Amino acid sequence: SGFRKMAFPSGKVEGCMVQVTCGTTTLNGLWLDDVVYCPRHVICTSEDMLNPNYEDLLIRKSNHNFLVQAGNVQLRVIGHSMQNCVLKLKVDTANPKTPKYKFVRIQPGQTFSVLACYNGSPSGVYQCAMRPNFTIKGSFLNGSCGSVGFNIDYDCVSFCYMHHMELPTGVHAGTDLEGNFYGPFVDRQTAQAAGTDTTITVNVLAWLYAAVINGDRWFLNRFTTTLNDFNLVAMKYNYEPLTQDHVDILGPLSAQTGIAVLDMCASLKELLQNGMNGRTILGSALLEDEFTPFDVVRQCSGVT
Amino acid sequence: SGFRKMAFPSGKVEGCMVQVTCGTTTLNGLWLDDVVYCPRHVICTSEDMLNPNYEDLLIRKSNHNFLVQAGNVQLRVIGHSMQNCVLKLKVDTANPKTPKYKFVRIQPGQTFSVLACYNGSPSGVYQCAMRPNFTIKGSFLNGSCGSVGFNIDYDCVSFCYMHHMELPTGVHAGTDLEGNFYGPFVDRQTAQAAGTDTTITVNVLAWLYAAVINGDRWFLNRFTTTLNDFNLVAMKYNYEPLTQDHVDILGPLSAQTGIAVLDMCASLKELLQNGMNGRTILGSALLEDEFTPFDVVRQCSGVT
Ligand SMILES: Cc1ccncc1NC(=O)C(F)(F)c1cccc(Cl)c1
Ligand SMILES: Cc1ccncc1NC(=O)C(F)(F)c1cccc(Cl)c1
């Protein structure tokens, strides 16, 4: 019992963190096998970030200009290449701590853990969701670029995010491990609009199931609704429209609790229309959308 | 920018987790140097937990009855001893992954990360606070006993908690690493009263400073208060009385933001008396008390 915003154990990722320095700039790199991945803006000076020509900036750099340090270990760089917004620094030594891993591009609404790092050293771990607008509401300061987001299934780390930048609004933007930004962002010091965000409906419903499993049941009511009716309410309250695909993924939670997905939708509809009336659900006074249905099943069963 | 309920990177602790089995019961153990620490109820059967005589139960056990497994590694047990509510199993091999560590007894109101484990395998990491009533509101299921709470300063892991039990109310109880329970709890399957809990005032104030540092300033007002006046409000709303010692530890945050501690107390007083009026602070619709002033300074500066 109890439900927490749980992050994956970060050990497998900590073993991969290195410091990357180029000229004046230092940030984090991810060392997997004989390659170190880091944001390509490591090659920029503060003045270059206004409108950087990365191809031209990288041409002035040689292998010996990229200083890669794994704490006390100095890595020898034998190749460098830019792939989208990431630099891939080939090193002469494969990381002995390389876990089984994959590079994945996550979907908006999915969750992942972040290992916030500074100067190649881990400082903390937290769980977050990729917002429907492709931003993350993380906790990052200068020097945190290169910190990565990941999920872990059995012994396999699926890397899904690399931190690149903080928008003028205080929200965060980054790329997949192929250097493709999530969302419309560009790695440049320019004001950039993040799209209109929405609340992740399927996740809120999953968290309402976790609340019932753990004893918070006050919000359950005698009503039901339809996908059509619920979606009119979701539209009014800036929630993602619920689809049959979302209902299908809530099947295990509906099956465990015996509460039909549309019956849970009617509880969510009433909470949207009436608020929480000064009460809490799983220690929260708002509707939480950072737990996917898989996260709920995992935490509620005890998956290691 | 951004503020998250950040846990310590769990790597150093993951390397210490083992599975301990005795008879029919399996739980988690912590392997530090040549000793494995685990809850003493590993020696009980379900029937023994009603009113266990641990001294008598441990007398029927020999070194070879304690099966300790570090994933694939089987440890040879050469000694066993009970210290308060923990068993210390001396093994013939020192854990090569033993980090620099200390055993500490934390104070109520302090925070720590928990590495939730099942069958000696880590499943997740989360940050929590030791409640003023010596319980923790964790996320633990059967098999999680032996999971530990910790803090990390530089390269040193200070172990402060070992999970033992879930109270009938769904809250959690455990011990320091010397096996002394936090609070009045006994390791027995009996209904046990947790004391009246309070909200950790100094932590709420610290989190209000973190909110100002990160841009959420709507709650700041033109008022001030005194320790006496604030404490009359804290008493009414079941908050811990604020002391000069608490004001002293808020000094760095008062110094960074230029907001006097008693001026922040007047904002907290108004939030207690009026509520949040449907607004949020750092993504929360309630007053958060799980961040200490040290946690705020650490996260806000980037301590690794
Ligand atoms: C200061 C900070 C705080 C949190 N997270 C990241 C950062 N850093 C940045 O945003 C940046 F200064 F490195 C930058 C500027 C423009 C474009 C890009 Cl790609 C990167
Ligand atoms: C079931 C569970 C869920 C979460 N956290 C822990 C547990 N387990 C327990 O409470 C227990 F059954 F092992 C137990 C019973 C009585 C006394 C003691 Cl010391 C331990």
- Judged by CB atoms within 8 Å, which residues 37-76 of A form the interface with B? none
Q: Which residues of A touch B284 (CB under 8 A)?
A: 284-286
- CB pair distance less than 8 Å for A2 and B303: no
Q: Which residue in B120, B99, B92, B96 sits closest to B34, CA to CA?
A: B92
Query: What is the DSSP secondary structure assignment for residue A190, as one 8-state letter?
Result: S
Three-state SS at B260:
coil
What DSSP string describes A241-264? PP-HHHHHHTHHHHHHH---HHHH
Neighbours of A23 (CB within 10 A): 16
CATH fold of the domain at B15-99: Thrombin, subunit H (2.40.10)
What angle do the packed helices B261-274 and B227-236 form, to 10 degrees?
A: 30
Q: Is A6 on the interface with B (CB under 8 A)?
A: yes
Q: Which of B2, B10, B143 is facing A139, going by the closest CB pair?
A: B2
Q: Is A171 on the interface with B (CB under 8 A)?
A: yes
Residue B28 near residue B120 (C-beta atoms within 8 A): yes
Q: Is A290 on the interface with B (CB under 8 A)?
A: no
Q: How many CA atoms lie within 13 Å of B100's alpha carbon, on the beta-carbon side? A: 5
Give the Å distance between the CA of B168 and the centre of ligand 2: 10
- CB pair distance less than 8 Å for B11 and A9: yes
How far is A213 from A302, CA to CA, in rounded Å? 14
Residue B221 near residue B266 (C-beta atoms within 8 A): yes
Q: What is the domain partition of chain B in residue ranges?
A: 1-14+100-197, 15-99, 198-301
Choice from B119, B185, B189 to test ligand 2 binding pocket (greatest atom count within 8 A of CB): B189
Give the Å distance between the CA of B182 and the centre of ligand 2: 15
Class of domain A198-301: mainly alpha
Residue nearest atom 2 of ligand 1, based on CA coordinates: A142
Neighbours of B120 (CB within 10 A): 22
Known catalytic residues of A are 41, 145
Residue nearest atom 6 of ligand 2, based on CA coordinates: B165
Q: Which residues of B touch A163 (CB under 8 A)?
A: none
Residue B145 is a catalytic residue = yes
- Was domain A1-14+100-197 assigned CATH 3.40.50.300? no
Residue A172 near residue A212 (C-beta atoms within 8 A): no
How far is A199 from B278, CA to CA, in rounded Å? 17
Neighbours of A6 (CB within 10 A): 24
**Chain B: residue whose CA lies nearest to A285:** B285
The closest ligand to the CA of B162 turns out to be: 2
Q: Which residues of A touch B141 (CB under 8 A)?
A: 1, 300-302
B15-99 against B198-301: fold identical: no
- CB pair distance less than 8 Å for B121 and A304: yes
Residue A251 near residue A206 (C-beta atoms within 8 A): no
**Three-state secondary structure readout of B164-193:** EEECCCCCEEEECCCCCECCCCCCCCCCCC
Resolution (A): 1.7
Q: Is A291 on the interface with B (CB under 8 A)?
A: no
Q: How was this structure determined?
A: X-ray
E-strand stretches of chain A: 17-22, 25-32, 35-39, 66-70, 73-75, 77-83, 86-91, 100-103, 111-118, 121-129, 148-153, 156-166, 172-175
Burial class (CB in 10 A: 0-12, 13-18, 19+), A107: exposed
